[PDB]
């Protein structure tokens, strides 16, 4: 039973790599789906920022006692963990620069609020809101890019899987099914004309080819030496 | 070569079902990721609605000539395809009812705007914005639910795959490797003591067991009938 490449070991290896590719494909898609929820929440907070931008305008105009609390809440939203987490190597620059520039433009907005410059603030709010919109767009573009990459990756994994399958089946035909058909004939021959058999297979059929030939060899001498 | 269950056919079937499960798992995750982009865009538009709610307040207060254009844009955003597409059997009621109620509450808001009731509109805007926030929350909850279902589904597919693998390998051991070891001994026996071999296998080893026995049977009579 000691063969160099037992058939079970070779199939188990194939299944291992096939299953590994499956888990990798599905795993990457699921991780990307989780990341999608975080992107959604970034988009949610950005929309909170747009609403809060107009509300500050109303606060100043009406002299609301909540002005300063609201200015503070705005600063906090701007620094939400979900937005600061975008500042990482694998997130595109389009997203991170636009995030940086939202912080920079807020500085001028807040300063103008501090100076009770309602005319300026009212004349510039559309602009700031537009900047938030472009930040959101960059986020949506990043999201779509990730999806398309996951599709590309799944297609590749697909090729690896189909290739692994095709090759293993081809190997089973060549290293298992073929020699079995030859053993069948080379057995119904000896039952009724003493083709030899491929002993160079590194699996169980190579061992059977040997021991068969060994047997089939001495029967040629025992059936001819006596007959 | 005519056997009822050739080994290649049984492996190809196993691979078929394994690959099918892989594609189903990864496919469902990718479809869910695509749906995630649509959810994100629903969240984006909902945030547009919050900003636009305060802006209408400023329009009325300042007597902006854009009031009516903005009222119109609000109505349009509210009826975006991305939001109306939520009205479907597979989207939860939590999402669809909240969407319905945003439309209903907008009716009263727009009516109060038409009556130049700035005091009411200013005293109720926080409420409406809150309703939009709860709609967003329902969307985020739907998103998380989908992800968790896709995780559950991928785990199940995992069990199907590992089960298919384990069974096929077990079958290869029982219906291929075992009879080969018996053919090996039952061949080094006849080379040097004439155990018989399992002809009831429905694969190629069952045919080889037969023809072997057929052969090994007549050699018992030809080696004893002459000796």
Curated annotation (Swiss-Prot), chains A, B:
It is found in: Cell inner membrane. It comes from the Bacteria. Residues 174-224 form the HAMP domain. Residues 35-146 are periplasmic. The chain crosses the membrane at residues 14-34, 147-167. Residues 1-13 are cytoplasmic. Coiled coil: none annotated. Acts as a sensor for nitrate/nitrite and transduces signal of nitrate/nitrite availability to the NarL/NarP proteins. NarQ probably activates NarL and NarP by phosphorylation. NarQ probably negatively regulates the NarL protein by dephosphorylation. This is Nitrate/nitrite sensor protein NarQ. It comes from Escherichia coli (strain K12). The gene is narQ. The chain holds residues 1 to 230 of 566 of the full protein.
